[PDB]
Amino acid sequence: IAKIPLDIDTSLVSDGTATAFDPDSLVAERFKIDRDVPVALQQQMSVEAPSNADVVTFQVGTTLRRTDRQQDAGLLLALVDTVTMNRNTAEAVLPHEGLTYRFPFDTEKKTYPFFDPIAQKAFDANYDGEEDVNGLTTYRFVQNVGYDADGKLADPIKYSASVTARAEVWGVPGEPDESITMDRFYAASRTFWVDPVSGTIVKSEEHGYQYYAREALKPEVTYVDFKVTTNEESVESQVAAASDERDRIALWTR
Numbered sequence: 008i009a010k011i012p013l014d015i016d017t018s019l020v021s022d023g024t025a026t027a028f029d030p031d032s033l034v035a036e037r038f039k040i041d042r043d044v045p046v047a048l049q050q051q052m053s054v055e056a057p058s059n060a061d062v063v064t065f066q067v068g069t070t071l072r073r074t075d076r077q078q079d080a081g082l083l084l085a086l087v088d089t090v091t092m093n094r095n096t097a098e099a100v101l102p103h104e105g106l107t108y109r110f111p112f113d114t115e116k117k118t119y120p121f122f123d124p125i126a127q128k129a130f131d132a133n134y135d136g137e138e139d140v141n142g143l144t145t146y147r148f149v150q151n152v153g154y155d156a157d158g159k160l161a162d163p164i165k166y167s168a169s170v171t172a173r174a175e176v177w178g179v180p181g182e183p184d185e186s187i188t189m190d191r192f193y194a195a196s197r198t199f200w201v202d203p204v205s206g207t208i209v210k211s212e213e214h215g216y217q218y219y220a221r222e223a224l225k226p227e228v229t230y231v232d233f234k235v236t237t238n239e240e241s242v243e244s245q246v247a248a249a250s251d252e253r254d255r256i257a258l259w260t261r
């Protein structure tokens with residue numbers, strides 16, 4: 008019925024709060040962890056080569072920054088991702104699988120595989136109900152990565168990463184000047200609000216958690232624990248884009 012357009016160029020922002028390690032304390036006497044820090048997650052998406060009649064490539068740059076700092080300070084996380092997807096299905100075709108940044112046209116009330124770029128694997132995005140978003144009826148989907156159905160930490164992803172520091176520097180118990188090596192782990196939970204016609208994700212809520220531990224289910228030191236939601240302006244921009252796409256599709260479909 009339709010193809011993902013080749014002229015997508017969006018910059019979306021999600022605001023929220025985090026507990027975060029201060030990267031500027033890496034060589035300090037004690038690793039500094041700041042609580043209840045305001046943050047902004049910015050996602051910039053642009054179309055790149057290869058894109059043609061069949062496929063579309065998106066380059067996505069994502070940053071998480073503290074908003075109680077000026078522009079040269081407070082960068083917490085940065086990720087660049089590149090994916091080529093089928094223009095008709097939105098499915099991925101470094102190797103990605105399933106949905107990544109959009110749902111298919113005529114999205115159904117069912118489970119979809121949705122890629123997590125840190126886990127480097129697709130996890131179920133389960134249908135969770137209908138909800139109005141700025142006058143548009145959307146389908147809500149929920150994806151858990153490392154958390155079970157009850158929201159308990161169960162299978163966090165171990166990064167392939169490790170950090171070695173004295174117990175006094177980590178701020179954990181230990182023998183005097185004991186050297187401790189901890190692995191980095193990741194777990195996340197996301198909610199997507201989807202326009203069922205165009206498949207556009209008009210709003211998202213994301214709760215990301217990265218920490219250091221000797222054992223996966225016994226987190227010891229937080230790297231980042233953030234919860235963000237797409238801001239009003241970004242939701243309005245996506246609802247407008249989805250609405251334009253829907254108006255165009257309505258002209259040649261039944």
Ligand SMILES: [Xe]
Pocket residue numbers: 069070071084085086
């Ligand atoms: Xe990020």
Ligand SMILES: [Xe]
Pocket residue numbers: 028038170
């Ligand atoms: Xe660290």
Ligand SMILES: [Xe]
Pocket residue numbers: 028038219228229230
């Ligand atoms: Xe850390």
